[PDB]
């Protein structure tokens, strides 16, 4: 008997699902995947439900100011998003203290601009919580109501909970390999060497993107084996693979990303106006994605701004991870020109076909330069043979205008000729995540 309460408004997309009145009471049965079967209270008939729309009644997951799952870094991004105000806040699980909590509050000063301050919410041994010992509370709800009435030592008085959008409905049960007929291709987004990309509708109810691979470009079995690894690479900064059509021409089905590639974005009216701290935040988002790929012993093989996608809310998501591996070299793909771009590719990958996480690190440094130049071609003024020979003699792209020296230093580290000398994405992540907050403490010590 596990009791669970609803949270959002959702009607059955399928024919087996129930209703959500933004408030209800349910009791879960089986807990496989992201769809759960639950015994509900309207009234004595049930079915399957999306797990991300519900929560246990005991935990704080029901509270509007609590954000389960998210990181410190993501708390900051969420809060600094447009639509939030001074003293906007959230409570989340602590990162550096298991079982305890953290308060994140949107702040402002003329000297540092918009910032997010973090406070340790310590738990008392016999029940209750405090930030400062002189002010303890039975519940986190009491803590919140307290600091809503006055800052009492915090940077700001709490105003309203961090805004949040209703999450993506989880993908249909056991719909990994789907029929081609289940997709309606509505708008061609782009045409490339080995396939096209379409905006499309799945089963007349869900917006997706579909990459349609050219006949001759991939083998069904080799692709499916690889895709079965790709789908498990689940992370906020990787684009999500929903499903595949396992019949030539092979279709790849993913979440749709409203702002297209980061390269397109940086070259748009809107993206060309992003300020440098936002550019650095894109870099950090990609580094986080790559550190996950690195921790999972996977290889991207074609990391560049063109293969980064951008959401409506400016989340960067890595796409085409691993795809280059299963694009075949034959008479068909050959008449399409270069398989990989020389200017983005590590020298050992070019010279010997040695693709590793370390050649991805090389590509990342190039991507960094693409970002800070808003999508300029690498090595301007140079041919491909000229780039290769210059690189062999220690030439590296010089630092451009409007590039912080520490960002350049990171690029130069990525561009070591010997791969073992290049940093880890775990390192790159940490430096970029803390780029502007290096000489600052994690949490504020409130008297
Ligand atoms: C200005 C532009 C109109 C020009 C155009 N730009 C193009 C830039 C990329 C655009 N694109 C590509 C994908 C995508 C990427 C990989 C996928 O598959 C995989 C495979 C393996 C792993 C992960 C995803 C699936 C979808 C995609 C998406 N999901 N949502 C929105 N736009 C997308 C398409 C236009 C161009 N001509 O370049």
Describe the structure.
By secondary structure, this protein is of the alpha+beta class. It folds into 4 domains: 1-62, SH3 type barrels, CATH 2.30.30; 63-164, SH2 domain (SHC Adaptor Protein, 2-Layer Sandwich), CATH 3.30.505.10; 175-260, Phosphorylase Kinase, domain 1; 261-435, Transferase(Phosphotransferase) domain 1 (Transferase(Phosphotransferase), domain 1). The chain is 24% helix and 20% strand. The protein contains 11 helices and 17 strands. The strands form 4 sheets. The protein has a 5-stranded antiparallel sheet, with no helix packed on it. A hairpin with a 5-residue loop joins strand 16 and strand 17 (316-318). The longest helix has 20 residues, at 276-295. It starts with a strand and ends in a 14-residue tail after the last helix. The structure holds ligand OOS. The ligand CC(C)C[C@H](N[C@H]1CC[C@H](n2cc(-c3ccc(Oc4ccccc4)cc3)c3c(N)ncnc32)CC1)C(N)=O binds next to strand 11, strand 13 and strand 15. The ligand CC(C)C[C@H](N[C@H]1CC[C@H](n2cc(-c3ccc(Oc4ccccc4)cc3)c3c(N)ncnc32)CC1)C(N)=O is lined by residues 189-190, 197, 209, 211, 230, 239, 241, 252, 254, 256-257, 260-261, 264, 309, 319-321, 323. Residues 183-436 form the Protein kinase domain. It is found in: Cytoplasmic vesicle, Secretory vesicle; Cytoplasm, Cytosol.
């Amino acid at each position: 008997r596990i009791i669970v309460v609803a949270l959002y408004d959702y009607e059955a997309i399928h024919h087996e699902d129930l209703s959500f009145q933004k408030g209800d009471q349910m009791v879960v049965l089986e807990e496989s995947g992201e769809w759960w079967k639950a015994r509900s209270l309207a009234t004595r008939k049930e079915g399957y439900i999306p797990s991300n729309y519900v929560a246990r009644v005991d935990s704080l997951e029901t509270e509007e100011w609590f954000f389960k799952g998210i990181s410190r870094k993501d708390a900051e991004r969420q809060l600094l998003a447009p639509g939030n105000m001074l003293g906007s806040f959230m409570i989340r699980d602590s990162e550096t203290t298991k079982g305890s909590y953290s308060l994140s509050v949107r702040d402002y000063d003329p000297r540092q601009g918009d910032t997010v301050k973090h406070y340790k919410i310590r738990t008392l041994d016999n029940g209750g919580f405090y930030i400062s010992p002189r002010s303890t509370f039975s519940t986190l709800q009491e803590l919140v109501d307290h600091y809503k009435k006055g800052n009492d030592g915090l940077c700001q008085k709490l105003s309203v909970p961090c805004m949040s959008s209703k999450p993506q409905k989880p993908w249909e049960k056991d719909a990994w390999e789907i029929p081609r007929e289940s997709l309606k291709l509505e708008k061609k987004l782009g045409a490339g060497q080995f396939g096209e990309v379409w905006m499309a509708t799945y089963n007349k109810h869900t917006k997706v993107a579909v990459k349609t691979m050219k006949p001759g470009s991939m083998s069904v079995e080799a692709f499916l084996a690889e895709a079965n690894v790709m789908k498990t690479l689940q992370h906020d900064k990787l684009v999500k693979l929903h499903a595949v059509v396992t019949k030539e021409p092979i279709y790849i089905i993913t979440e749709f990303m409203a702002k297209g590639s980061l390269l397109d974005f940086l070259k748009s009216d809107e993206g060309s106006k992003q300020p440098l701290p936002k550019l650095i935040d894109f870099s950090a988002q990609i580094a986080e994605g790559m550190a996950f790929i690195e921790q999972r012993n996977y290889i991207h093989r074609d990391l560049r701004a063109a293969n980064i996608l951008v959401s409506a809310s400016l989340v960067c998501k890595i796409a085409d991870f691993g795809l280059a591996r299963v694009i075949e070299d034959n008479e068909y793909t050959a008449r399409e020109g270069a398989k990989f771009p020389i200017k983005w590719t590590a020298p050992e990958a070019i010279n010997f076909g040695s693709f590793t996480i370390k050649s991805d690190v090389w590509s990342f440094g190039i991507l960094l330069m693409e970002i800070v130049t808003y999508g300029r071609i690498p090595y301007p003024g140079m041919s491909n043979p000229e780039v290769i020979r210059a690189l062999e003699r220690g030439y590296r792209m010089p630092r451009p205008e409007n590039c912080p020296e520490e960002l350049y230093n990171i690029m130069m580290r990525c561009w070591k000729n010997r791969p073992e000398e290049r940093p880890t994405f775990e390192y790159i992540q940490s430096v970029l995540d803390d780029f502007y907050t290096a000489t600052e403490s994690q949490y504020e010590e409130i008297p």
